Design a binder for this molecule. Structure first.
Ligand SMILES: [Cu+2]
Ligand SMILES: [Cu+2]
Lengths: 109, 109
């Protein structure tokens, strides 16, 4: 999806890449953190259903963790897209904007 | 994905199949409704960003729609897997639960 689309279509120049390296790594770490909650939650679901295959309080709670984590990933990705944009050379923002707006437009049709 | 796995995944008698096809339609409609809301949000993000490439009131509201949709999808998938289970004769439930448990545990790694 959208992070990967931008990184591929619109690659950073050598200075942008050095400059954005800490932010790219912090995003990676954030993404891994959210994904680790979503997997833990899959674990809690396997565990619960092994004990009682039913829509139990454990399964309700775990589902709510999966919900949160899914939404959090989308917010964290969107804020990162803007963060990246800000570190680009002003001359590079138009292509990046096009690629972004097109990706969102695609996602609307 | 989880859906795709289960699906494969246990034999169905004619009567189970009939009902599980009804349930598949119902799940299809729900997935479409959430997709619609996600698409509508994505358009709004695209519109706002083309106008002003910053985190505006419009971006915020659309991002919250996207978050809720991403979560709704994941809840819907999990509800459906129980709904499918509810279509199976009692005797055939243990085998389904084994595949589901396995799936969720692989999903936790
Ligand atoms: Cu990035
Ligand atoms: Cu299904």
């Amino acid at each position: 999806d959208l992070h990967e689309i931008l990184h591929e279509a619109v690659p950073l120049d050598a200075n942008e890449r050095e400059i954005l390296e800490l932010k790219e790594d912090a995003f990676a770490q954030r993404r891994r953190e959210i994904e680790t909650r979503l997997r833990a939650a899959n674990g809690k679901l396997a565990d619960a259903i092994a004990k009682n295959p039913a829509w139990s309080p454990e399964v309700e709670a775990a589902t709510q963790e999966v919900e949160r984590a899914a939404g959090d990933l989308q917010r964290a990705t969107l804020v990162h897209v803007f963060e990246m944009r800000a570190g680009l050379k002003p001359e590079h923002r138009p292509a990046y904007d096009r690629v972004l707006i097109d990706a969102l437009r695609r996602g609307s049709q």
